[PDB]
Amino acid sequence: LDNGDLMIHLQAPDLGSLNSGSLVYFRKIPVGKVYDYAINPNKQGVVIDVLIERRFTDLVKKGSRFWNVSGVDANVSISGAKVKLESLAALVNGAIAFDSPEESKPAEAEDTFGLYEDLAHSQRGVIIKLELPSGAGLTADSTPLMYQGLEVGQLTKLDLNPGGKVTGEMTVDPSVVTLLRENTRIELRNPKLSLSDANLSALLTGKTFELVPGDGEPRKEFVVVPGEKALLHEPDVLTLTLTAPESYGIDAGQPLIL
Amino acid sequence: LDNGDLMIHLQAPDLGSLNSGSLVYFRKIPVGKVYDYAINPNKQGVVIDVLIERRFTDLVKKGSRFWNVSGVDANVSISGAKVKLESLAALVNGAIAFDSPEESKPAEAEDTFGLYEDLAHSQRGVIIKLELPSGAGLTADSTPLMYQGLEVGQLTKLDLNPGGKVTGEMTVDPSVVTLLRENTRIELRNPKLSLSDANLSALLTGK
């Protein structure tokens, strides 16, 4: 109708449950709808053309982030599972929602955006590259980064580069960016069982990264060492070598006592 | 229609499942409906204009508390899980409910109110600041404060101030306010296992 509405494009790996007429939300308020959808000339991607009303043209910014809320999903959580249903229109047909940053220039003239598959995936953060030893108990979008007992990061990407090199990418919230400096150790904590203080939640979570802040020039890449090598890789540590004619029943976990 | 009805505004982080025509309840009795909704000039907040009928104008007070009942939620509880459905209109479209204090002046002329997301969040209480050592096993809106074995408080807010300072805020019911004095110790109890007296509920609750 050319009523001053704003037409924008979203690039997605697939269309998903979104169809023509599915709504677009800001603070769960309908401010637009999907005008059309098509496939790119390259067969990999789908371009969804959406339209935002004239009143809400200034809502869309350059830094605005879009995610898809479609269908109904039930998640079972440890030590208590909660399933909540809020939108029935998104259950029946699907919808798109977007978040607008406070300080950004407005977007116009068919500006392209990336359609994230979930709000957690569309959460803002900083990418950190991790050189993991192995991915035996690491799950993408499920392993957190606990600092002082609170989750401040999330391992989102996990890959196996050739040569058997397990690598990963983790999104960290902006609050702990200043804590990522030189000689900062990001190690993995195995789930241990304590008879005096049993932690069923910690047992069920499994592998969990731990952040040990340091000082120096900020860095975006880290090498993850296990808890066995956590003491060895400390910034200050006295490393010693001792030779013997026999092992004397001493393994690689025995503690030195003074 | 200007039939003597009372128009009031509710500020929320988001509109939620509430739409135009969704009902407003007092003691689960329909006494009004959502007239309109809009966004604040600041993009953070949503103002929902609701209208209460002429008969129930005196029900709304200055201290009245509003919460949102929308959709259907199923909660699994330890040692037995119960899921109850009561309202289907709130399931389909959503609704707002409000509680009116006994001793408060009536509200009028577009008085603003805060729309809590749940009845538990809208529960009245006293805020207590806690300087926690760590939040390893502490969950917001899930860790209670047990006194004499009975829950009298609820840790509702949990933050990490810079410098690695884990802090929190806990809502306590008015009965135990007089018990919060000097040299009063609020400590954390780890879930211990006793062979003679096994407590599976205490083991599952955690901190």
End-to-end Cα distance, chain A: 83
C-alpha span between A50 and A68 (Å, rounded): 13
One-letter amino acid for residue B145 of the chain: L
The amino acid present at A130, given as its one-letter code, is L
* CA atoms of A66 and A60, how far apart (whole Å): 10
Residue A193: count other Cβ atoms within 10 Å of its Cβ: 10
Ramachandran sector of residue A170 (left: φ over 0; alpha: ψ -120 to 50; beta: rest): beta
Mapped onto helix, strand or coil, the DSSP state of residue A256 is: coil
* Whole-number Å distance between alpha carbons of A84 and A73: 9
DSSP B150: E
Amino acid at B116: Y
Chain B residue whose CA is closest to A90: B17
- Within 16-35 of B, beta carbons closer than 8 Å to A belong to 16-17
Interface of B with A in 138-167 (CB under 8 A): 138, 142, 158, 160, 162, 164, 166
The Cα–Cα gap between A121 and A67 comes to 8
In degrees, rounded to 5, the angle at the alpha carbon of residue A187 between the alpha carbons of residues A181 and A193 is: 145
Decide: A132 and A84 in contact? Cβ < 8 Å: no
Method: cryo-EM
Look at residue A166 and give its three-state secondary structure: strand
Q: Are A68 and A18 in contact (CB under 8 A)?
A: yes
Is A65 within 8 Å of A121 (Cβ atoms)? no
CB-based contact B16 A29, cutoff 8 Å: no
Is residue A44 within 8 Å of B30, Cβ to Cβ? no
Residues 78-137 on A with a CB inside 8 Å of B are: 79-88, 100, 102
Closest partner CB to B16 (pick from A86, A178, A199): A86
Q: Which residues contact B69 (CB under 8 A, 6 or more apart)?
A: B25, B87, B90, B94, B95, B96, B97, B119
Q: Where are the beta strands (DSSP E) in chain A?
A: 6-12, 23-25, 30-39, 46-52, 65-69, 82-85, 95-99, 112-116, 126-131, 143-147, 150-161, 165-172, 185-189, 208-212, 221-223
CA atoms of A152 and A150, how far apart (whole Å): 6
Q: How far is CA B163 from CA A145, A235, A247, B133, in A?
A: 17, 20, 45, 12
Q: Are B38 and B47 in contact (CB under 8 A)?
A: yes
The SS3 of residue A45 is: coil
Q: How far is CA A164 from the centre of its chain?
A: 24
CB of A137 closer than 8 Å to CB of A168: no
- Residue with the two structure tokens 């890789």: A233
> How far, in Å, are B28, B96, B97 from residue B24 at the CA level?
8, 5, 5
Q: How far apart are CA B9 and CA A147, in angstroms?
A: 40
Question: 3-class secondary structure for A85-135?
Answer: ECCCHHHHCCEEEEECCCCCCECCCCCEEEEECCHHHHCCCEEEEEECCCC
Asked whether A64 and A115 are in contact (CB, 8 A), the reply is no
Task: Indicate the burial class of B23 (C-beta count within 10 angstroms; 0-12, 13-18, 19 or more).
Answer: buried
Classify residue A76 as exposed, middle or buried by CB count within 10 Å of its CB (0-12, 13-18, 19+).
exposed
Residue B176 φ/ψ, nearest 5 degrees: -100, 15
Contacts of B14 in chain A (CB under 8 A): 27-29
Using CA atoms, how far apart are residues A162 and A109, in angstroms rounded to an integer? 43
Q: Is A55 near chain B, with CB under 8 Å?
A: no
Q: What is the DSSP letter of A165?
A: E
Ramachandran angles phi, psi of A65, nearest 5°: -115, 130
Q: Does A201 touch chain B (CB under 8 A)?
A: yes
Length of chain A: 258
Q: Please choose, from the candidates B37, B14, B17, B43, the residue with its C-alpha nearest in 3D space to the C-alpha of residue A100.
A: B43
Residues of A in contact with B158 (CB under 8 A): 150
